[PDB]
PDB file of C-alpha atoms and ligand atoms in Angstrom:
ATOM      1  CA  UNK A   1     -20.054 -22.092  15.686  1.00 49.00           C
ATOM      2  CA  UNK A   2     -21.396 -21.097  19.033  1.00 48.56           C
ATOM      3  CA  UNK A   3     -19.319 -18.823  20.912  1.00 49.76           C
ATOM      4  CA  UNK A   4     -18.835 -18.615  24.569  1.00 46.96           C
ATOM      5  CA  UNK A   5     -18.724 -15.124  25.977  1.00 45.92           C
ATOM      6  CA  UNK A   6     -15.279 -14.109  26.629  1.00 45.35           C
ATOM      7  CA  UNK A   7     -14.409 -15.547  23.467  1.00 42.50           C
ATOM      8  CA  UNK A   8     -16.299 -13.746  21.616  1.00 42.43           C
ATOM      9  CA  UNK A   9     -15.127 -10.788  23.464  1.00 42.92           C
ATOM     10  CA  UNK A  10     -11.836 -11.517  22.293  1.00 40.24           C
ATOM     11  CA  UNK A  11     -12.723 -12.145  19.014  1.00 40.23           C
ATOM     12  CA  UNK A  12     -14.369  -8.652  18.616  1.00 38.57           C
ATOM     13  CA  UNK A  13     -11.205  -6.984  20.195  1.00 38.19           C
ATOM     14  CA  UNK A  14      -8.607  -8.691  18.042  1.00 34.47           C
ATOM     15  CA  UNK A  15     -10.527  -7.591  15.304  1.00 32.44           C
ATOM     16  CA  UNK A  16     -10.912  -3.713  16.366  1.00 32.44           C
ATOM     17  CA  UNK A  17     -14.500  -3.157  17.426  1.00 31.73           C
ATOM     18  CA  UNK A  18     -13.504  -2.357  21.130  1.00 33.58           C
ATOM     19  CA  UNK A  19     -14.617   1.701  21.383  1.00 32.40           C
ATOM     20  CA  UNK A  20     -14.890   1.717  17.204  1.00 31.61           C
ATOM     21  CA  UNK A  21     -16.769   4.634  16.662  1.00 33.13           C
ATOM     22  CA  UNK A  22     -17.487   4.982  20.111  1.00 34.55           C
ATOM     23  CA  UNK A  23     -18.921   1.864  20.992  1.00 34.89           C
ATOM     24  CA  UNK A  24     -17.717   0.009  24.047  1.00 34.29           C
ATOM     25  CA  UNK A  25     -16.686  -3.554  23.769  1.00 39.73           C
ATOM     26  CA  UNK A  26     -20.182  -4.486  25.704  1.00 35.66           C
ATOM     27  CA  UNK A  27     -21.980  -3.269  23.146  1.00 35.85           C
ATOM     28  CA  UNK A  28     -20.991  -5.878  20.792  1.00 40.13           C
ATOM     29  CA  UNK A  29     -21.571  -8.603  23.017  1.00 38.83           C
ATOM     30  CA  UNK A  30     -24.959  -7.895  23.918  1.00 39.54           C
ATOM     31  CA  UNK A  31     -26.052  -7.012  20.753  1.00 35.07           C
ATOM     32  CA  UNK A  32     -24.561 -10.490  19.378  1.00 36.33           C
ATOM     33  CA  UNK A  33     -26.225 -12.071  22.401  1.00 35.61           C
ATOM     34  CA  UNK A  34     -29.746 -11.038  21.263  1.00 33.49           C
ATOM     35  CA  UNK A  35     -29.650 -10.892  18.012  1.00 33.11           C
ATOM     36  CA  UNK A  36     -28.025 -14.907  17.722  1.00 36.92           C
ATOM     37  CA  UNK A  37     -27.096 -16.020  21.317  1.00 36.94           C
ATOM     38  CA  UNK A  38     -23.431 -16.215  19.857  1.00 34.99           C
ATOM     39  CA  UNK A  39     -24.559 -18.397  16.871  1.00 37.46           C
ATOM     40  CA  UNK A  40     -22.699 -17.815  13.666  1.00 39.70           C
ATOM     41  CA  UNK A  41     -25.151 -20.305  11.501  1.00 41.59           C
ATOM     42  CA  UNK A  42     -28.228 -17.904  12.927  1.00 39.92           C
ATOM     43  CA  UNK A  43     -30.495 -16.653  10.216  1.00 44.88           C
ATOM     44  CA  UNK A  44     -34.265 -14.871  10.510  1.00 44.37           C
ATOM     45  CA  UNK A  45     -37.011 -13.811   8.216  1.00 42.75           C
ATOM     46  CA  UNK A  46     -38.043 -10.516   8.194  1.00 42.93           C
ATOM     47  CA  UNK A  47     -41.721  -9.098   7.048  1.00 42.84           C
ATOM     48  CA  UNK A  48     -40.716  -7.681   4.055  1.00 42.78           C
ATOM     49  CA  UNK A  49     -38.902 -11.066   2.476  1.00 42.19           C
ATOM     50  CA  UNK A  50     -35.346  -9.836   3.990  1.00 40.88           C
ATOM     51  CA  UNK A  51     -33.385 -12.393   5.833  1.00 43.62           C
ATOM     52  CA  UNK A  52     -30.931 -11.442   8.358  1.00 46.88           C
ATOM     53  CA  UNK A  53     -27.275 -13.130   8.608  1.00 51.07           C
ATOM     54  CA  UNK A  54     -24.663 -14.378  11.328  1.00 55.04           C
ATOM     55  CA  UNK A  55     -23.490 -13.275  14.878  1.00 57.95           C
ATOM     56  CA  UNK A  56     -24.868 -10.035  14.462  1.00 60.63           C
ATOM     57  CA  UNK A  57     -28.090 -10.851  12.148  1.00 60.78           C
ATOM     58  CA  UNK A  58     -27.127  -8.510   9.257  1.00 62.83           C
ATOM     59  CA  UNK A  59     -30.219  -8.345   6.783  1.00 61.68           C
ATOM     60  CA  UNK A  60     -29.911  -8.894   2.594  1.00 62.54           C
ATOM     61  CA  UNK A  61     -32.057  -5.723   2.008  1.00 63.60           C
ATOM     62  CA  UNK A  62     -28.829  -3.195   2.228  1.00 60.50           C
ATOM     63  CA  UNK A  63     -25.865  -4.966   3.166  1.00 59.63           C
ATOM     64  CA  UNK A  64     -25.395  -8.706   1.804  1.00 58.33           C
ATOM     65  CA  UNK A  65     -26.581 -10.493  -1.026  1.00 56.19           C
ATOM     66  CA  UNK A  66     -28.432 -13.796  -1.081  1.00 56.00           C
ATOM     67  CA  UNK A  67     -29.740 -14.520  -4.397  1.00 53.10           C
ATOM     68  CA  UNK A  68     -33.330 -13.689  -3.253  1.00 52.54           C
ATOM     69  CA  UNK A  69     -34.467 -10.132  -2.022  1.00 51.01           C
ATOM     70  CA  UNK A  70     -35.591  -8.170  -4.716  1.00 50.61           C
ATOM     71  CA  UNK A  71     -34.970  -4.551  -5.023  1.00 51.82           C
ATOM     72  CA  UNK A  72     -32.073  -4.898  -2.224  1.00 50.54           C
ATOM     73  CA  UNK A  73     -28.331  -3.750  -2.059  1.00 52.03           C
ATOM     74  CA  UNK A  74     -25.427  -5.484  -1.093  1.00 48.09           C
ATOM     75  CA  UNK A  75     -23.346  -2.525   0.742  1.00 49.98           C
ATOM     76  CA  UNK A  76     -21.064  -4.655   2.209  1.00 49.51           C
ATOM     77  CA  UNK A  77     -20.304  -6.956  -1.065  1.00 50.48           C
ATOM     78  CA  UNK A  78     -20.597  -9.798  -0.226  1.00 50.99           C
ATOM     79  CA  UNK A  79     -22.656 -13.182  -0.343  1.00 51.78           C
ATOM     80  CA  UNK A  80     -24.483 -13.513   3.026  1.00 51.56           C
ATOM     81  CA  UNK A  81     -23.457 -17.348   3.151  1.00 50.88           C
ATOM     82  CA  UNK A  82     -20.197 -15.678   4.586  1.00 51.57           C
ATOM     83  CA  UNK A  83     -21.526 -14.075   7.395  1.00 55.97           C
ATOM     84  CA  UNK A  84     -22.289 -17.869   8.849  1.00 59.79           C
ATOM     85  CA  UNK A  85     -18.961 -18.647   9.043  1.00 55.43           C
ATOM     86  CA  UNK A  86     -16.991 -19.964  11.999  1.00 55.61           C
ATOM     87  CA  UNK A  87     -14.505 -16.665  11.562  1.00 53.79           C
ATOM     88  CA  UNK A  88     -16.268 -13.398  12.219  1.00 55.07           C
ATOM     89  CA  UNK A  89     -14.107 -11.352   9.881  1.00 52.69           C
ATOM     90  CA  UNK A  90     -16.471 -10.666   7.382  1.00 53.66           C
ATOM     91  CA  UNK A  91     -19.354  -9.845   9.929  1.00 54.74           C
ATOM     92  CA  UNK A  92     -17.169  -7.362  11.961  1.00 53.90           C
ATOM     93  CA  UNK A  93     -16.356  -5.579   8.948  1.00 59.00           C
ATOM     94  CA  UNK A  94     -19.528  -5.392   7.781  1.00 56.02           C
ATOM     95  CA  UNK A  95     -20.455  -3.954  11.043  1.00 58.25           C
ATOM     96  CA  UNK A  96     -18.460  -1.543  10.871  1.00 61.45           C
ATOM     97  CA  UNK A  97     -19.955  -0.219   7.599  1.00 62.96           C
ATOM     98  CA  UNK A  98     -23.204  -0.039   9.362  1.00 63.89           C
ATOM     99  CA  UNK A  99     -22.146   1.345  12.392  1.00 63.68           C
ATOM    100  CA  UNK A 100     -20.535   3.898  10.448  1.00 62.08           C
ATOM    101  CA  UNK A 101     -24.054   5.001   8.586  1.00 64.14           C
ATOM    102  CA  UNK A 102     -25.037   7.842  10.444  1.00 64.06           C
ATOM    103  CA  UNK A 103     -27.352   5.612  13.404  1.00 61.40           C
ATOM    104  CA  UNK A 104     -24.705   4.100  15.214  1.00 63.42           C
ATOM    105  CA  UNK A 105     -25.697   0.760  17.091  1.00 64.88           C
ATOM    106  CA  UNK A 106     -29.475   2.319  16.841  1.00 64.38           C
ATOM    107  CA  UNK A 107     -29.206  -0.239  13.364  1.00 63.77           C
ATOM    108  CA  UNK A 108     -29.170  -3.014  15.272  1.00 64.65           C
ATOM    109  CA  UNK A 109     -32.959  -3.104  17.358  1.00 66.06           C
ATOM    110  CA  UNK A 110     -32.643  -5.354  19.531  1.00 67.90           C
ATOM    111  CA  UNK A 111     -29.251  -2.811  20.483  1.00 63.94           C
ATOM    112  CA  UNK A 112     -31.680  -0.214  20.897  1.00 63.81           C
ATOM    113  CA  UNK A 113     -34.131  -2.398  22.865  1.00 62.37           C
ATOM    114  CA  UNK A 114     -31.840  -4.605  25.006  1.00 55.41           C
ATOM    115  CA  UNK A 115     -28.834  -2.930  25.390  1.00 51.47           C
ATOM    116  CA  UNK A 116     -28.847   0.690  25.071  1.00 52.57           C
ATOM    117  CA  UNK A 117     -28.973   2.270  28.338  1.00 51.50           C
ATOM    118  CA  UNK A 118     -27.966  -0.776  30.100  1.00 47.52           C
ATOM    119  CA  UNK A 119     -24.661  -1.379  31.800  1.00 49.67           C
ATOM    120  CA  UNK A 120     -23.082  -3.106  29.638  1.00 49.70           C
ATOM    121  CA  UNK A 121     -19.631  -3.517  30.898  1.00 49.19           C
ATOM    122  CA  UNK A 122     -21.619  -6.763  32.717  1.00 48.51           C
ATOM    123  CA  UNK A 123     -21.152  -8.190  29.289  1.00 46.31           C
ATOM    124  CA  UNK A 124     -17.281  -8.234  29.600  1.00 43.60           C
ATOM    125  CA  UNK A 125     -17.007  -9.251  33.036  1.00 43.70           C
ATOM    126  CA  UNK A 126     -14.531 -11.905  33.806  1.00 46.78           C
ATOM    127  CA  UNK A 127     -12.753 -11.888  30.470  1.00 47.61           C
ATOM    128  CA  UNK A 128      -9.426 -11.689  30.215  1.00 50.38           C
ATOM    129  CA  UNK A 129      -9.111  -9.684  27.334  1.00 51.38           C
TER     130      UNK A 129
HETATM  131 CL1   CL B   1     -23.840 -15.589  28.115  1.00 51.29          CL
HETATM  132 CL1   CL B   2     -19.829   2.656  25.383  1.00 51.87          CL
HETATM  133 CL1   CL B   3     -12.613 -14.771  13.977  1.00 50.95          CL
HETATM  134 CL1   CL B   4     -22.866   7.192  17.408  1.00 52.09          CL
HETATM  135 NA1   NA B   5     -18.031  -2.404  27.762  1.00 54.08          NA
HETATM  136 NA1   NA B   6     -29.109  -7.677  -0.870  1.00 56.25          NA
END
């Protein structure tokens, strides 16, 4: 599924990430933007033979498991085939388990690179929420 925006905006509010540890609502949306422009089938290679997941690109080395990363974890317990799906649950509270691992958003690079230190709210303008 490919979200629009304020959709996802809601999404990520009905399911508790506005201000979770913290983190503004705009946060979420911009990472999701640059990590999958608001694709849940989205799904990357990383250099050391990780793959990252979903709306918010969640990699197989700690948090997911897919069969194929050898030496990895699986934090969140769960097959990353469900982190594609059309309903974010499982990829929100995932996140949340990351978020909540002592870095904050600073897990999520393109975060650190796109977002942080932005304004942010511009992510959430317009929505009715
Ligand atoms: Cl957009
Ligand atoms: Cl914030
Ligand atoms: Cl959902
Ligand atoms: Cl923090
Ligand atoms: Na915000
Ligand atoms: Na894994």
């Amino acid at each position: 599924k490919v979200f629009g925006r304020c959709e996802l905006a809601a999404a990520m509010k009905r399911h508790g990430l506005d201000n979770y540890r913290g983190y503004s609502l705009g946060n979420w949306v911009c990472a999701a933007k640059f990590e999958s422009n608001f694709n849940t089938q989205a799904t990357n290679r990383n250099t050391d033979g990780s793959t990252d997941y979903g709306i918010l690109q969640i990699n197989s080395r700690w948090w997911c498991n897919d069969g194929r990363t050898p030496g990895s974890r699986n934090l969140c317990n769960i097959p990353c085939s469900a982190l594609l799906s059309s309903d974010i649950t499982a990829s929100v509270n995932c996140a949340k388990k990351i978020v909540s691992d002592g870095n904050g958003m600073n897990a999520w690079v393109a975060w650190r690179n796109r977002c942080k230190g932005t304004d942010v709210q511009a992510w959430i303008r317009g929505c009715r929420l």
